[PDB]
Amino acid sequence: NLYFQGWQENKSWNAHFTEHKSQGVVVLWNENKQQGFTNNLKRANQAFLPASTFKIPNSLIALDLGVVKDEHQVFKWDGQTRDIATWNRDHNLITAMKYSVVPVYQEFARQIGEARMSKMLHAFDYGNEDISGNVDSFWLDGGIRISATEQISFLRKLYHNKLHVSERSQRIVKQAMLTEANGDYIIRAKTGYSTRIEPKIGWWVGWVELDDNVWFFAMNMDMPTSDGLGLRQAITKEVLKQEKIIP
């Protein structure tokens, strides 16, 4: 039988959003204490399109089915010129995730296919597990929905290698999730920006590795234009600093 004390609501963190003239939620989970904290318990449980944060489960499935052989395999540019310059080149899994290269992952989705994608998402217990829409864009404008607290749940399984895919697939995706590391912490995370369907939100989900603990985080925020995308990380780090998790 699972046990859970509940999410504590700390409305103090709301200052970090209002002082940036913004609206959103940050959710934190203390792995050692098995305690969760948020500034907004309702928005914490509100489900949105995952957008580019779907690259995490998408990468795991592609690797586990052999669609992606390893983190060095090159997915060559299809020659279509797109709005994001870094997309108009060849990529491997590391760089495709760092530059959030959508057309590489849509190709992953097509090769995975509807049937296996649905079955894997059910095995992951991922969000609402609904892939209705185009096989290669349902996480951008289809039926799939996931909340900040469901993101923590999924990430916790990935951290402990508990997802129903190979340990190796999971190690590879956690490698590709690497975002920042120094003498004080490691951050493995994925950004996201949902623009195709309202409301337009930005995501940042992942976790902070310390010497003797892991803090999982999931945040999203209203994002009416791309000028505020940097706030996804800045607001989260302000909360991490306030709680003395990072210096």
Ligand X SMILES: *C(=O)[C@@H]([C@@H]1N=C(C(=O)O)[C@H]([C@H]2CCCO2)S1)[C@@H](C)O
List residues with catalytic annotation: 52
| Contact of residue 175 among ligand X, Cl ion, none (CB under 5-8 Å per partner type) | Cl ion
Q: Find the shortest distance in angstroms from Cβ 76 to Cl ion.
A: 25
Cα torsion 24, 198, 205, 182: sign: negative
Decide: is 51 part of the binding site for ligand X (CB under 6 A): yes
By CB under 6 A, tell whether 140 contacts ligand X.
yes
Q: What is the dihedral angle through the alpha carbons of 169, 55, 102, 108, rounded to the nearest 10 degrees? A: 40
Report the interface residues with Cl ion, using CB under 5 A: 175, 178
d(CA 104, CA 208): 27
Nearest 5°: phi and psi at 220? -140, 165
Q: Should residue 178 be labelled a site residue for ligand X when binding is judged by CB under 6 A?
A: no
**Cβ within 8 Å of residue 3, ≥6 positions away:** none
CA-CA distance, 177 to 197, in Å (whole number)? 26
Does position 201 interact with ligand X (CB under 6 A)? The reply is: no
CB of residue 97 vs ligand X: minimum separation in angstroms?
Answer: 10
Residue 226 site contact among Cl ion, ligand X, none (CB < 5 to 8 Å, cut-off depends on kind): ligand X
Binding site for ligand X (CB under 6 A): 51-52, 100, 102, 140, 191-193, 226, 229
